Amino acid sequence: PHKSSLPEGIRPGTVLRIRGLVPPNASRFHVNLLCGEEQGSDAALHFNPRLDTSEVVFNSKEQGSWGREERGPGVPFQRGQPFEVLIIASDDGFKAVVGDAQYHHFRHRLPLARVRLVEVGGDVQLDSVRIF
Numbered sequence: 001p002h003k004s005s006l007p008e009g010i011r012p013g014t015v016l017r018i019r020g021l022v023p024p025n026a027s028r029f030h031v032n033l034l035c036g037e038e039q040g041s042d043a044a045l046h047f048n049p050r051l052d053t054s055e056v057v058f059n060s061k062e063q064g065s066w067g068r069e070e071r072g073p074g075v076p077f078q079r080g081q082p083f084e085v086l087i088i089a090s091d092d093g094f095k096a097v098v099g100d101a102q103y104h105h106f107r108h109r110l111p112l113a114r115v116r117l118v119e120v121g122g123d124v125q126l127d128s129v130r131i132f
């Protein structure tokens with residue numbers, strides 16, 4: 001798993017660019033926007049492409065409890081193909097862009113101000129996480 005500290009946190013206008021490869025026969029992977037470094041800390045966003053079930057799940061986690069899942073329109077990821085994702089913070093939520101297309105808007109469930117860390121985990125071969 002990859003961890004990126006957010007020394008200025010995430011503000012409206014902060015862009016996370018995540019580049020990587022979905023390996024052959026990948027099951028699923030995730031990008032988490034976390035509210036602490038501790039194992040089990042709250043997730044403001046859990047972005048979860050599931051290649052094995054052909055879904056992309058969006059959710060939040062508070063005090064160890066998951067919220068209600070949102071699902072994106074289709075799966076803009078392929079086993080054996082590289083990807084580029086933008087997670088863009090606005091005042092009203094996160095915009096997920098995949099490749100050259102706006103994909104999903106996730107309304108804030110936790111305060112933006114609480115986000116401290118970006119974690120990338122699961123069956124993905126990460127190239128880079130950049131914060132702009």
Ligand SMILES: CS[C@@H]1O[C@H](CO)[C@H](O)[C@H](NC(=O)c2ccc(C)cc2)[C@H]1OP(=O)(O)OCc1ccccc1
Pocket residue numbers: 046048057058059066069121122
């Ligand atoms: C599929 S249900 C649940 O959906 C959630 C979004 O609403 C999350 O995607 C959650 N995933 C996770 O909690 C998770 C954590 C770490 C890693 C490396 C991979 C996955 C995921 O939990 P998990 O995949 O552990 O649940 C299935 C399960 C539960 C108990 C025993 C076996 C499998």
